[PDB]
Amino acid sequence: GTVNWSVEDIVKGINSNNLESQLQATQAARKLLSREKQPPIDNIIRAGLIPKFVSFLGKTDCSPIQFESAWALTNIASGTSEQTKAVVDGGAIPAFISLLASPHAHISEQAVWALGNIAGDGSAFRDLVIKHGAIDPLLALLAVPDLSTLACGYLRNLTWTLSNLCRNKNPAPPLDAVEQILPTLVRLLHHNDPEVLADSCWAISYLTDGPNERIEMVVKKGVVPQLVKLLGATELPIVTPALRAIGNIVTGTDEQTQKVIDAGALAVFPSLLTNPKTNIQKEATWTMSNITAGRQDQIQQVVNHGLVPFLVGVLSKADFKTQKEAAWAITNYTSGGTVEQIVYLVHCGIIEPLMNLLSAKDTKIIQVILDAISNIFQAAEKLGETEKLSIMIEECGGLDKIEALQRHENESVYKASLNLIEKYF
């Protein structure tokens, strides 16, 4: 009945002076726009239908046409930035924000969805959505004693749209908007739905992806223990953002990093550093690299938790991008670590896999590895042990690889290598 209309049929119906014909044509547009294969968004826009859809959002008297137009506009806004812009340029933002108050849950939800798509376009529309006042009404939809009474899909859509208001940088969301949203995120982070948890973790990962003052806003809210708990979830869609968030947090201060350690994060890293999902291993190792860039007592907790053998493991065998993060973890470890900690690292077998990576066709990892070799030697001469160390490097082919690096197409590489070959070989 409303299936497979032409755009011109839709235009004809929406231009009739007949609200029911308009509703029928808007639903036909919605069904057109709801098919996964090549929805004719541009034809719909070119036909001038967005302003009509937007005007239909205001027809409180005809809630079906609000819903159908909200859904049509949601799917136009889900398209390209130009398509989202067409929706915004039609005045949809204030019209959707007004629909958040709709008594019809499926219309309110659709407006949530539409605003998520608009905000999800980028910082400017995100901030324009915020400036139009979306946050208060969005959070009010979550102002219930127990989130579990909300419809599952509705709560998921709200959490997702909130995460888009937290998303994107240059600029990051307004500080006041973040402070306004955070209490609700913290609460969603304790909800038991895996998708709400995933999107809540994504939102926190966005908010912690910035300067330490941004991290601090999040950490002050006490979420780190919950993020660590979610770090141990079985659902990869949860572990992924929880780990991103934790990784972001340990890019901050030593005190912020220490909150992650105190929360027990390190006990999860045996699994994370051996995780069969490549991106988990990579992000876990990146996280480790920023923990080993911290204080010596923080390095010591990496040690006590038995994570140095896991770093040796990653360095020995992993996706190359993960090995590069592991190399950073080692150079940070050796830059900041006591002599005893660096000795322990050698006793765990770091030398051989470090050496094997010096044959990487990647200039940055070579530099990183050479820094670490240098830092390990520095600790050796504090013990009169450079000879034992040099043998080790020779015993596993490392001396050969440091030799070839002297003649290498890069200043810092040839420099640091040549230095090693004479200061210790």
């Binding site: 799917n75 889900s78 798509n117 972001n248 990146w286 690299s289």
Partner: peptide, 13 residues
């Protein structure tokens, strides 16, 4: 020495 989800979703059903 520290170093530092679909955004848009159509409704199909």
């Amino acid at each position: 020495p520290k170093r530092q989800v679909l955004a848009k979703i159509p409704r199909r059903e």
